[PDB]
Amino acid sequence: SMQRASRLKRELHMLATEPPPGITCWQDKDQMDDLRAQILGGANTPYEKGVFKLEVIIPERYPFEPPQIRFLTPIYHPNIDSAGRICLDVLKLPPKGAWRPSLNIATVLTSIQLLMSEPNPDDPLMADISSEFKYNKPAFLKNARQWTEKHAR
Ligand SMILES: COc1cccc(-n2cnnn2)c1
């Protein structure tokens, strides 16, 4: 689609020139729909000083379907599984999800960054991590720092 191509050119321009703080997103090679991203661990979170790489695949029906995004860097988190799958509303279409075409790549990467600082334990992909987050926060923070040290630094 040329509608899709023109939109991706604009988004890549905006990601290059006005990236959200802590976030970078780029073309892996020469295809505007095969992207990579990076989110820095937030300050005052157990992921601080980690650098987290993500894969960002733009489906054929974008912007009417959401970007398909998974962590490539392992992360210890209630809403992200061991393969990097992310449970987040803006990465899914209605009725269950929140994606709409007025969101964009920068918007959902910012939502993922926020998810990292503020887990949603009521909708987990990792039930044991979620219970630990809810009921033994000091142990969750220590495990999340150690996982960051081992895999993201
Ligand atoms: C609030 O609960 C929700 C809402 C929307 C999507 C999800 N998903 C989690 N993993 N895939 N979708 C969970």
Side-chain angles (χ1 to χ4, degrees), residues 79 85-93 95 97-98 120 122-125:
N79 303 110
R85 292 201 305 146
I86 305 166
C87 184
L88 173 64
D89 54 357
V90 291
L91 293 180
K92 296 302 193 179
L93 275 163
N120 302 331
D122 289 341
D123 303 278
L125 281 178

Coordinates of all heavy atoms in Angstrom, one line a residue, residues 79 85-93 95-98 120 122-125, ligand 1, unseen atoms left out:
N79 N 4.2 -8.9 32.9 CA 3.5 -8.8 31.7 C 4.2 -9.2 30.4 O 3.7 -9.0 29.3 CB 2.9 -7.4 31.5 CG 2.0 -7.0 32.7 OD1 2.4 -6.1 33.5 ND2 0.9 -7.6 32.9
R85 N 7.3 -12.0 24.6 CA 5.9 -11.6 24.3 C 5.4 -10.6 25.3 O 5.6 -10.7 26.5 CB 4.9 -12.7 24.2 CG 5.1 -13.7 23.1 CD 3.9 -14.6 22.9 NE 3.3 -15.2 24.1 CZ 2.1 -15.4 24.4 NH1 1.1 -14.9 23.5 NH2 1.7 -16.0 25.5
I86 N 4.7 -9.5 24.8 CA 4.2 -8.4 25.7 C 2.7 -8.4 25.7 O 2.0 -8.4 24.7 CB 4.7 -7.1 25.1 CG1 6.2 -7.1 25.0 CG2 4.3 -5.9 26.0 CD1 6.7 -5.9 24.1
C87 N 2.2 -8.4 27.0 CA 0.7 -8.2 27.2 C 0.5 -6.7 27.5 O 0.8 -6.3 28.6 CB 0.2 -9.1 28.4 SG -1.5 -9.0 28.5
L88 N -0.1 -6.0 26.6 CA -0.4 -4.6 26.7 C -1.5 -4.2 25.7 O -1.5 -4.6 24.6 CB 0.9 -3.8 26.3 CG 0.8 -2.3 26.2 CD1 0.4 -1.7 27.6 CD2 2.1 -1.7 25.8
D89 N -2.5 -3.4 26.2 CA -3.7 -3.2 25.5 C -3.5 -2.5 24.1 O -4.1 -2.9 23.1 CB -4.7 -2.4 26.3 CG -4.2 -1.1 26.8 OD1 -3.0 -0.7 26.6 OD2 -5.0 -0.4 27.5
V90 N -2.6 -1.6 24.0 CA -2.4 -0.9 22.8 C -1.7 -1.7 21.7 O -1.7 -1.3 20.5 CB -1.6 0.4 22.9 CG1 -2.4 1.5 23.7 CG2 -0.2 0.2 23.5
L91 N -1.3 -2.9 22.0 CA -0.7 -3.8 21.0 C -1.8 -4.8 20.5 O -1.4 -5.7 19.8 CB 0.4 -4.6 21.6 CG 1.7 -3.9 22.0 CD1 2.8 -4.8 22.6 CD2 2.3 -3.1 20.8
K92 N -3.1 -4.6 20.8 CA -4.2 -5.4 20.3 C -5.3 -4.5 19.9 O -5.5 -3.4 20.4 CB -4.7 -6.3 21.5 CG -3.7 -7.3 21.9 CD -3.2 -8.2 20.7 CE -2.5 -9.4 21.2 NZ -2.1 -10.2 20.0
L93 N -6.1 -5.0 18.9 CA -7.2 -4.3 18.4 C -8.4 -4.5 19.3 O -8.5 -5.4 20.1 CB -7.6 -4.7 17.0 CG -6.9 -4.1 15.8 CD1 -7.1 -5.0 14.6 CD2 -7.4 -2.7 15.5
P95 N -12.1 -5.7 20.3 CA -12.7 -5.2 21.5 C -11.8 -5.3 22.8 O -11.9 -4.5 23.7 CB -14.0 -6.1 21.7 CG -13.7 -7.3 20.9 CD -12.7 -7.0 19.8
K96 N -10.9 -6.3 22.8 CA -10.1 -6.5 24.0 C -9.0 -5.4 24.1 O -8.7 -4.9 25.2 CB -9.5 -7.9 24.1
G97 N -8.5 -5.0 23.0 CA -7.3 -4.1 22.9 C -7.7 -2.6 22.7 O -8.9 -2.2 22.6
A98 N -6.7 -1.8 22.6 CA -6.8 -0.4 22.5 C -6.2 0.3 21.3 O -6.1 1.5 21.2 CB -6.2 0.3 23.8
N120 N 1.2 -4.3 35.3 CA -0.2 -4.6 35.5 C -0.4 -6.0 35.9 O -0.7 -6.9 35.1 CB -1.0 -4.4 34.2 CG -0.9 -2.9 33.7 OD1 -0.7 -2.0 34.5 ND2 -1.0 -2.8 32.3
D122 N -2.7 -7.7 37.3 CA -4.0 -8.3 37.1 C -4.1 -9.0 35.7 O -5.1 -9.7 35.5 CB -5.1 -7.3 37.3 CG -5.3 -6.9 38.8 OD1 -4.8 -7.7 39.7 OD2 -5.9 -5.9 39.1
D123 N -3.2 -8.7 34.8 CA -3.3 -9.3 33.5 C -1.9 -9.8 33.1 O -1.3 -9.3 32.1 CB -3.8 -8.3 32.5 CG -5.2 -7.8 32.9 OD1 -6.2 -8.5 32.6 OD2 -5.3 -6.7 33.5
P124 N -1.4 -10.9 33.7 CA 0.0 -11.3 33.5 C 0.1 -12.4 32.5 O -0.7 -13.2 32.2 CB 0.3 -11.9 34.9 CG -1.0 -12.6 35.3 CD -2.1 -11.7 34.8
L125 N 1.3 -12.4 31.9 CA 1.8 -13.5 31.2 C 2.7 -14.4 32.1 O 2.9 -15.6 31.7 CB 2.6 -13.1 30.0 CG 1.8 -12.7 28.8 CD1 2.7 -12.3 27.7 CD2 0.9 -13.9 28.4
Ligands
LIG1 C1 -6.3 -5.6 30.6 O1 -6.0 -6.9 30.0 C2 -5.6 -6.9 28.7 C3 -6.2 -6.0 27.8 C4 -5.8 -6.0 26.5 C5 -4.9 -6.9 26.0 C6 -4.3 -7.8 26.8 N1 -3.4 -8.8 26.3 C7 -2.4 -9.4 27.1 N2 -1.7 -10.2 26.3 N3 -2.2 -10.1 25.0 N4 -3.3 -9.3 25.1 C8 -4.7 -7.9 28.2

